Symmetry: D3
């Protein structure tokens, strides 16, 4: 197989700001098809409050619908933290995190599903702490590129929380059941080499090379078939998500079927008020 | 167990219009907590175009976030059709249904997921045809109340489409594998009695009684525990949706854990920069 | 719009393709139906290893004949569809072959469908039963069991209470009982059995063969884990190959150049 | 099975010594019967009741003369009304005499599930709430014409989102399961039969007579085949826990073969095993 | 996150004997909440006979119901073996291991289920051989701490047995399918480093420090929320055990619901013979 | 307790069974190993529909030969194991074209055949295992890799994908993070990289590839064939839902037939009596 030149992979990146209207995040797009979502609350180690999550959902929705975007990067502002999870300062007694109107949210669950069902690869670019809900977020991303200063772990049993959804089951599909139980039960911190050794991240690079390397990985994907990528992502989800995974995988099959003459004949016949004739389309074995 | 007040179930219903801004649907709310989404394209048997689906998504999102709403009804305008599925007149060659900007969508998949993950019961109120994607929509709703004039079925293999996601697997969890294969492979139409006999709808009533009966069922649910309902809906999805189902079910467990003193101690300790003391909370077996 | 009943109930012209077979008949109609008939009425159409080998061969032929769109499985005579394994484990291979067949398979049942013969009708996508049809398992009565698709898939048809009843007691069930529990798709008078079955086949023969195979795979996928994903994804690959985007990948490789996927717009 | 055998008289030997909340009885032809005996509270279970039911079911499992177990309630008015609400504490469960909070019916559910002998629910009158989940968990349900079924969770501030939800759906389908749980209606015996929730409905006066007939039909059959099929049917629901049961039965069968035994013998005789004598099947 | 002091983690441990009545095992409890079950048949490399398993089941049940116990350690007596599986000297022809009365048991399957469903973490403390059924036992434990002399492997295909239950499927969820097939098909032995590298154990420590390090890990968990731990254990089981896993996870959710005012209102209304009133409890989104 | 190394590393005697095959070689050892070798080195051992048909035929023979206990799959030469579907014959109409113009995806049949084979199948990989050829080594129960082996997928680059066992089952081997990397980027991985991620069972010098593979086969050949087939089914059952249950339960039925209780139906028939199951003591 022929491969892309490293010179192109390491070409300069031109980012354009698309952050207007956002208070808690930055949102940027490169000319060559990368969207970057940056949590921008470094004073609280990039913890998310409900507003933060709402903005991330809005940005990811925009990235999904922009046909010039092929890959999304999720990251945190600064070098100290990717994300430290839900903002404990606004965590209420009544079953969620409080917004300024007093409504209690667990809206990161919506963002998790949105990352999961996104037909474009999402890459976590991790510098410093990826902890708690912030650790589940990196796990949800298809790939994780980690700096050598990255630190990983959960804190639920120490802070009176837990993610028993994708935070548990999907973690096990990454690091295996023994390591998943250790990570959750003891709530230790793991350095970048430890994370790499257990298969929790895809690669570790020096912090100075983090963005350069991440952009390289994104560009490798951008050279590939977007249709193939979305089908494979759905197929990999389908090993985990039961009928919800089937919904994604089968939905892509329908999309492909619509592009065939056989599928189109069914539509055409209905619009033309006649019976379809599928006899011209030979049956494969 | 004491029973609901029968006279109360049949009290008059006061609807308020919330349709401002919508072109393809109506959206209404009752004073006692029912939201009603009505597809309003009877000239095409209430077939949905991408705009229709976008509007339904917006209304369901509003219903989810309105804490005064406890149950949602999905229905079609007029008595002739609930929904005839995707609008074939705008179905493009390029893998989806075309909006006025020429973008190709399969956004009913998003709407399916939104119904699935909605923590409030969604009730399909079916008069006349529920066909194709419109049949999958009634199936996705938690309950279906059918008029005696209701007609059910798929048309995919006749019209050059298929829903191999929840439209297939989840149908089988309702009517069984033999009936599911019949429904999909032959694309016949089934009357209301046939649908009831196979467990495809919850009840059949005369058309004249359809809204009255639907409102009664909604009111029975509205007097019950909203927390129990959302946990049970998640638990029933979890028999189908693998890790995506675990995400919903465990997420509700987290919400409940946040309401306990043990959970709150973890938050409090973190905010107060001290170690938590969980020893006061006795271990159940 | 639906096909005319005059067409659905038109006469059927069968051609024999049974050369070489000792235990079965194999026939094909002009309009795309293949029919496999277990032909051992003297033993209530029980299968022996040769029978199973022949059925596999016939079904393999039907799969590869692009003129065939639907397969009927049935027994010779009016007394039995199949009474299972011969009294005096390759049927598992035959079960798998029915499951993975990209064409609909219809069980046409007159009289007894019992034991391994009962699991066979269940494996078929649809079952059309005559009013004299009788259904049930016998394993626990004779010291056997089918704990594979014979158990789990049975439960996906009739539900868990009835599956346990059917297996634990080994009663016989008449056609009405089977219909009521969702075990068969329809019941018709014995004299009309083939006539109605052919109608059902012809209704499917009017529909998209690609859609049918995708849906069959999708329904299998609710049951068969990664093996089901293999079928469903495999059809997706087949479709992808028919697209310009897929073909560009092939063309680029053969032309020893990098592919350019940029003309193929990203759908949301 | 002819009628003389299926409808032979029904006689019981009492084995209830030591129990406060249940009766436990055995027949000569291989049936054990566990009867919840708290009719004054519609046969609601308190933690002691569940502990006793577990003890009785364990006894039935280990008694090689027993092939089938019947679960039922005393009197004609109730099978079981679920957890005893009078002793339900604030701290996450039902309180015993020590003040410990239990949800021990979950242990009893798992024990019915993994029991290698068929368990049959014999239902007269109310099977409601946790009592309804109990009939669903039994392999078969025989209902009297006076039987009434339903859940009450969303009305009583509880839910069974385990086998009470998912397994119900495998019986009545997802539409009916959501109706049963969300509305908390009661369903009569005819309604239950029509939706497939029970296996048969019989006149109340004939309830035990018919239940015992069903038991006797199973008792004529292979106990090993039954336990393998029960495991196989659980395996369609219970993932690896189901695989544990099904494969466990395969191990038991393998131990009974000469091939399996050669391995043991070789180890005990401190030599290499020789499996060459045993032909490889396709 | 603040972590416990190492001085506390490595403080001496004081054990109290609770072995009265046991013939094949020891059972001990520490003042700070650890229960330890020790197989005591070193003359047969700590192989279990049916009595051994019955005793282990009794001890584990005691640990589950003792509200002062938060973590359980499973181990073997001496330094040479953790457990060598079923006692082949008492394995009968008739489908199981014989007790002194001649009844044939496979009761370790009950013990596997009991470890699985135990709401407290169970830790395998492994010195020397963990082989056959004894290897499955370490795998079933939530975590495994191994001494540098530990040896791991299966022997089924060599001794005429197999564990195709959790011994196969769950092994694959720990070490992956390639290694699971290697381990089972060839029946080799693996040293502690090999086991660590494939993710089969959580850590490897010097033999002299085995209990010291194990007690440290236990104490780290004892500082954490017992409710969070049991929910996460159930959640991780749920990725494997289908509806049986849902029973555990949902059961914990019910327990939490019982602790809420909303749940309690339902109980109260029933006990007071009145309609429940759930209107005071706001619906979260 | 364990076998002798002298026996494990003894010479191997192969006899040819390739008569009739155009695209593969097929050989059997005296001690119970069958070896299927793809023989199209000029296309890096890429398979066309005929190649797959022949491999299916050979594997069926090995399955049915009771003298065979283990099967090796490998490629001819040292440069390639298999490079996947032959792109030179890949048609527009949904598959790879044979000489008659029929479009096939018959490697899917071969995948299922390897999966359901009751004997262990071992991938012996020298050089490239790429694309459909990479899925094939993954499907094999074990993979022994030479130090020159190269692994990877190319789907998104060549306009294809295997979203069946090629995706889900890969994830059960290397985990979800690495599976997504392997598929999304289509890089190549060397033998060390593959070993480190758990994609292969061992890496050995190329000169020793067959010697070590035969040793692994011989270690399995000394073990119980029944236990091995039950375990293979049990391990498939963690992945394949009801299809996996079919295999596992089918083995249970076979075992049951070997017991007196299982035989009671046959015996009753021959003795002209009704079966009596009351006589068999119930285990708990
Ligand atoms: C390991 C650190 C990330 C960094 O340590 P470091 O020593 O560098 O800094 P530190 O001094 O702790 O923190 C700096 C400042 O940031 C703040 N901060 C850090 N993390 C958070 C945070 N998560 N929330 C609020 N404030 C935070 C600190 O309070 C402090 O600010 P200050 O009070 O001085 O003004 C540490 O800050 C830490 O342990 N943070 C807490 C992590 C944590 O427990 N997160 C919540 C876990 S649970 C969760 O995320 C979550 C969310 C949504 C869920 C939805 C459904 C189901 C489950 C969910 C869930 O589990
Ligand atoms: C429909 C009945 C069964 C019968 O109606 P009926 O009108 O004939 O009789 P009733 O007058 O209500 O009852 C007669 C007496 O029995 C008592 N009783 C009936 N059921 C219960 C009961 N369940 N608990 C305590 N007392 C009960 C009544 O209080 C009353 O006693 P009294 O005041 O005269 O002294 C009715 O009594 C009734 O609705 N009972 C309550 C049903 C109920 O809500 N059960 C609890 C559901 S939740 C549950 O069971 C459960 C248990 C364990 C779980 C574990 C893990 C996860 C979930 C769990 C779970 O959801
Ligand atoms: C059985 C009816 C519902 C009613 O018959 P009736 O005789 O009463 O009325 P009819 O005369 O046919 O229709 C009245 C008018 O409505 C129009 N109409 C009805 N349904 C549709 C429709 N679905 N699309 C466009 N026009 C429709 C007719 O064209 C006609 O309008 P006109 O031509 O006079 O201007 C019939 O109209 C009918 O078969 N309609 C087509 C149903 C159909 O095939 N729908 C699409 C199935 S597939 C689909 O929905 C779908 C959508 C999204 C998906 C996303 C992911 C994966 C799969 C998806 C999917 O499969
Ligand atoms: C590698 C060793 C663990 C240690 O080697 P070492 O060289 O240090 O010691 P060794 O000389 O072999 O043994 C010392 C003494 O202990 C005895 N011993 C060791 N293991 C066992 C043992 N498992 N049973 C009985 N005796 C044993 C030896 O016989 C010997 O006793 P002695 O002759 O002096 O009186 C070796 O002893 C050994 O391979 N033992 C056998 C391991 C084995 O095959 N276990 C059974 C596997 S299958 C299993 O466990 C099992 C159980 C329940 C199941 C239930 C359901 C489904 C499956 C199940 C299952 O697969
Ligand atoms: C990395 C190599 C294996 C070796 O590189 P190398 O540099 O050593 O050699 P190269 O010069 O590229 O190749 C040598 C010769 O072999 C040929 N060749 C190698 N592989 C293939 C090949 N796969 N098809 C056709 N020709 C091939 C080359 O064209 C060339 O021949 P020539 O033109 O000079 O006559 C490279 O040749 C390569 O990338 N080959 C293509 C691999 C490839 O994309 N395979 C198809 C992936 S998709 C697939 O396998 C597949 C199959 C069935 C499926 C069924 C259901 C669902 C999915 C399926 C599926 O995805
Ligand atoms: Cl920055
Ligand atoms: Cl956390
Ligand atoms: Cl009109
Ligand atoms: Cl449709
Ligand atoms: Cl069903
Ligand atoms: Cl309830
Ligand atoms: Cl073993
Ligand atoms: Cl590929």
């Amino acid at each position: 197989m022929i491969y892309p030149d490293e010179a192109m992979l390491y070409a300069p990146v031109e980012w354009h700001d698309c952050s207007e209207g956002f208070e808690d995040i930055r949102y940027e797009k490169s000319t060559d098809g990368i969207a970057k979502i940056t949590i921008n609350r470094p004073q609280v180690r990039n913890a998310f409050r409900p507003l933060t999550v709402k903005e991330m959902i809005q940005a990811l929705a925009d990235a999904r619908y922009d046909d010039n975007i092929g890959v999304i990067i999720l990251t945190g502002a600064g070098d100290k933290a990717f994300c430290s999870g839900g903002d404990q300062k606004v965590r209420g007694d009544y079953g969620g995190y409080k917004d300024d109107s007093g409504v209690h949210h667990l809206n990161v669950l919506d963002f998790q599903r949105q990352i999961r069902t996104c037909p474009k690869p999402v890459v976590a670019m991790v510098a410093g702490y990826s902890i708690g809900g912030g650790h589940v977020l990196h796990m949800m991303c298809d790939l994780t590129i980690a700096a050598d200063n990255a630190i990983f772990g959960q804190t639920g049993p120490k802070v009176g929380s837990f993610d028993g959804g994708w935070g548990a089951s999907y973690m096990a599909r990454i690091v295996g059941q023994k390591k998943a139980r250790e990570i959750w039960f003891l709530c230790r911190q793991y350095d970048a080499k430890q994370a790499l050794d257990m298969g929790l991240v895809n690669t570790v690079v020096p912090l100075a090379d983090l963005e350069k390397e991440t952009v390289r990985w994104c560009r490798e994907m951008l050279q590939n078939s977007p249709m193939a990528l979305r089908c494979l992502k759905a197929a990999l989800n389908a090993d985990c998500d039961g009928q919800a995974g089937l919904q994604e995988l089968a939905g892509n099959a329908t999309m492909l079927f619509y592009m065939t003459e056989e599928g189109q004949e069914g539509r055409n016949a209905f619009n033309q008020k006649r019976q379809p004739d599928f006899s011209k389309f030979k049956r494969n074995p």
